[PDB]
Amino acid sequence: GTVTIEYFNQKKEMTKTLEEITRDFEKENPKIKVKVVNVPNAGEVLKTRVLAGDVPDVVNIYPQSIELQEWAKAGVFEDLSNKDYLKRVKNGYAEKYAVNEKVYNVPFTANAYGIYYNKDKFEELGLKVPETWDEFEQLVKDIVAKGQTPFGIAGADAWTLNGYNQLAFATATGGGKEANQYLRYSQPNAIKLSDPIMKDDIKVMDILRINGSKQKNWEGAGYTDVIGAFARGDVLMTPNGSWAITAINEQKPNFKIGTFMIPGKEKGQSLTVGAGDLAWSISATTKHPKEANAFVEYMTRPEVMQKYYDVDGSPTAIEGVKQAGEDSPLAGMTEYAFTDRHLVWLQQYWTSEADFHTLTMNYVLTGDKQGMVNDLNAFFNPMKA
């Protein structure tokens, strides 16, 4: 009678809201039960489960990932090309992450990356949003001079600075394809310390390495600790994705939250990075395909999607959803969503990303400029060969 399906979740920040939508689905479909699964190291466990052959019915997988690309070709995921609900996805966002000209992922939302800032304290200290690298250098120094902590960096979570270093190369080269040309599709051992592009990368990275730029006990600070630190007003800024604001809002800040994109060398060269945030795939070997499809179809509904957006905040590709204006806290970060200024994660054409997080954070810890170059070459050479 009643059949149970599973939804593998990687959106830890939205657990409470996604479970609320699930119950709303369960109340409308009494013959269907859905288990929302949240596990630590969800990326590794999903790899484990896909190999083991215990693929969850509905899977939150990021559509730019090589995992999605490889598994879709293998036939792990159901083809969703001829589904009616795929027409509810505007901006041709479903077709963007097509594999063999076939859609295997429904990306509901698009995540972005930038800098969160405390509007109140910024006004209090009379500081403006930077528009160049040099202005971003000056802002950090001026916060230090005022006796405040500019950045809250999570030293124990290297992934938090993934978007930062990816935008460091992006603003240095011009975009995503330009960044992958220097790092990924270049010759083996092409990345040199003398390269102006690498000199630019270091310069952008050195902004996090200004004297007194980071909070006390940052080396062993987690993602949760930095959210709390920013919410209390211990730090004025924190670099993170658009996925963080729901957890920041949770902590009840005593200030209005603002965002801005990482600037380029000159004005009007700022970029953002991201892909499908809330992005769902259906297992091809699911025992209950009708029930699983209905669950995905449910999330494509505008009044259901409004429930998610009003909490999350990331731009949605779903039609009929009233999105927040330019007064929104995520505005400065997510303004250029679905434009040329928003480039896909660079690990769309990599084999992994874990080591890129390491070498990014290692530099913030050490400052070894040659060491970072060595790490970059050591990371990208296996992909070229």
Ligand SMILES: OC[C@H]1O[C@H](OC[C@H]2O[C@H](O[C@]3(CO)O[C@H](CO)[C@@H](O)[C@@H]3O)[C@H](O)[C@@H](O)[C@@H]2O)[C@H](O)[C@@H](O)[C@H]1O
């Ligand atoms: O830049 C980091 C990350 O961005 C994209 O994934 C967005 C995703 O990141 C975070 O999720 C975690 C850490 O909390 O990261 C892994 C996935 O990489 C998950 O196991 C875990 O939940 C945020 O907490 C999420 O809200 C957000 O959805 C991109 O897809 C990744 O490749 C990676 O570059």
